[PDB]
UniProtKB/Swiss-Prot annotation:
Positions bearing the site annotation: Reactive bond: 19-20
Protein's UniProt keywords contain Membrane: no
Entry's Gene Ontology BP terms: negative regulation of endopeptidase activity
UniProt keyword Disulfide bond present: yes
Keyword terms: Disulfide bond, Protease inhibitor, Serine protease inhibitor, Signal
Organism name: Helianthus annuus
Name the UniProt record assigns to this protein: Trypsin inhibitor 1
Disulfide bond annotation, renumbered to this chain: 17-25
Lineage: Eukaryota, Viridiplantae, Streptophyta, Embryophyta, Tracheophyta
PTM notes: This is a cyclic peptide.
GO MF, any single term: endopeptidase inhibitor activity
UniProt propeptide residues: 1-14, 29-31
Residue span relative to the full protein: 26 to 56 of 56
Amino acid sequence: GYKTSISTITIEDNGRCTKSIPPICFPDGRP
């Protein structure tokens, strides 16, 4: 589901580190 290619639909973001649970520098997060 996560697009590798950047897509600034409103804000610029991709990969990096999550700002929620679980806090990890991986493209995965719990809703």
